Paper text:
EBOV is a typical non-segmented negative-sense single-stranded RNA (−ssRNA) virus. Similar to other −ssRNA viruses, the RNA genome of EBOV cannot exist as a naked form, but must be encapsidated by NP and further form a ribonucleoprotein (RNP) complex together with RdRp. Previous studies have demonstrated that N-terminal truncation of EBOV NP resulted the loss-of-function in NP-NP interaction and the first 450 amino-acid of EBOV NP, forming the core domain, is sufficient for the formation of nucleocapsid-like structures and viral genome replication. In particular, this region was revealed to exert the both the function of RNA binding and further NP oligomerization to form high-order RNP.
The best construct with the highest expression yield and biochemical features covers the region of residue 36–351 of EBOV NP (named NPcore hereafter). In the structure of EBOV NPcore, one molecule is observed in the crystallographic asymmetric unit. All residues of EBOV NPcore polypeptide were be built into the final model, except three short gaps (residues A123–S126, E139–T143, K257–R263), and one loop region covering A326–V334 cannot be traced due to the lack of interpretable electron density, indicating their intrinsic structural flexibility. EBOV NPcore is featured by two relatively separate portions, an N-lobe (V36–R240), and a C-lobe (F241–E351). Both two domains are predominantly composed of α-helices, in which the N-lobe consisted of thirteen α-helices and two β-strands and the C-lobe consisted of seven α-helices. The major positive-charged crevice is located in the interface of N-lobe and C-lobe, in which K160, K171, R174, and K248 contribute the most essential positive charge. An additional minor positive-charged region is adjacent to the major crevice and is consisted by R205, K211, and R298. In EBOV NPcore, the hydrophobic pocket is comprised by Helix-14, Helix-15, and Helix-19, a number of hydrophobic residues contributed for the formation of this pocket, including V247, V250, I254, L255, L264, A268, V273, V277, F280, L284, L287, and L316. However, this hydrophobic pocket in occupied by P protein in NiV NP, but is accommodated by Helix-20, which is consisted by residues from N325 to E351, in EBOV NPcore. In the structure of EBOV NPcore alone reported in this work, Helix-20 folds towards and interacts with the hydrophobic pocket on the interface of the C-lobe of EBOV NPcore to form a compact structure.
Residue numbers in the entry: 35 to 122, 127 to 138, 144 to 256, 262 to 325, 335 to 350
Write the structure that this text describes.
């Protein structure tokens, strides 16, 4: 973890125009490889920071990433009219060269719809997106282009979200840190991020909600389940290190999250099921209940 992930930050006077090209390319499923991060960042820069590079670079998003394995490199690029001109191989330039209804905010809010069920699989995730689109449409909150509501387009964005850390991180951060009087796209993003809390971490949510009482639920005090309580406590201690991102650890593939796999805790899960029918703070609460047992 000594070596950093380096992300070029392309500074253009063209940003809205370049974002339209970026959106067009992602829709066509262009495989940007190592450059995808840089182009997704530019969308976030335009939408969340009103194109203000200085404020983006001193933002809490960037401060966190710089402290956790990333380095950002500003490259000033005057006179760019085509994405090809920002590419730092062979076939991507051809694809972009062949390039002949929305905006960056819309692209990002649509992408955020994939967060709540991303880790559950394509079928479940796409069904969730379709239902959410109809909810937002009925509340009059947002409407997406005709082209984006095909199963085919959703499969493209699903794969983009599944594989790209930075866009998930920036959406999640945005969802927790909006500027006053936020717009419809930000409302959708913040809603998506709220829905995504503890996605892929069912055992954490349910243990903290149903087994925590503070003491452990009486069924979680037996010596038979003591191995599971100890294992959970250790795993939760490590999760708490991720601070406000802990509920999203499975979404963001953060360290130590494999230790919280559901299957690793059958006895606690069974207890939680019987009952039902920040993270740093709750770890301290769990520490307290455990010690008492």
């Amino acid at each position: 973890a000594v070596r950093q992930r380096v992300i070029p930050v392309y500074q253009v006077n063209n940003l809205e125009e370049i974002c339209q090209l970026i959106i067009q390319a992602f829709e066509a499923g262009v495989d940007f490889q190592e450059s995808a991060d840089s182009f997704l960042l530019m969308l976030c820069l335009h939408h969340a920071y009103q194109g203000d590079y200085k404020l983006f670079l001193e933002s809490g998003a960037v401060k966190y990433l710089e402290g956790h394995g990333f380095r950002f490199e500003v490259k000033k690029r005057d006179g760019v009219k085509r994405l090809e001109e920002l590419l730092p191989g062979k076939n991507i330039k051809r694809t972009l060269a062949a390039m002949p209804e929305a905006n960056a905010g819309q692209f990002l809010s649509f992408a955020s719809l994939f967060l709540p069920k991303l880790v559950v699989g394509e079928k479940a995730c796409l069904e969730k997106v379709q239902r959410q689109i109809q909810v937002h449409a009925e509340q009059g909150l947002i409407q997406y282009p005709t082209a984006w509501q095909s199963v085919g387009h959703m499969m493209v964005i699903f794969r983009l979200m599944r594989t790209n850390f930075l866009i998930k991180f920036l959406l999640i951060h945005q969802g927790m840190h909006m500027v006053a009087g936020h717009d419809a796209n930000d409302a959708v993003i913040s809603n998506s991020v709220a829905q995504a809390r503890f996605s892929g971490l069912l055992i954490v949510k349910t243990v903290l909600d149903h087994i925590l009482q503070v003491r452990l639920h009486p069924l979680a005090r037996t010596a038979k389940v003591k191995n599971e309580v100890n294992s959970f406590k250790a795993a939760l201690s490590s999760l708490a290190k991720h601070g406000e991102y802990a509920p999203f650890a499975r979404l963001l593939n953060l360290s130590g999250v494999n230790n919280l796999e559901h299957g690793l805790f059958p006895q606690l899960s069974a207890i939680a099921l019987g009952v039902a029918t920040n993270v740093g703070e709750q770890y301290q609460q769990l520490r307290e209940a455990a010690t008492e047992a």
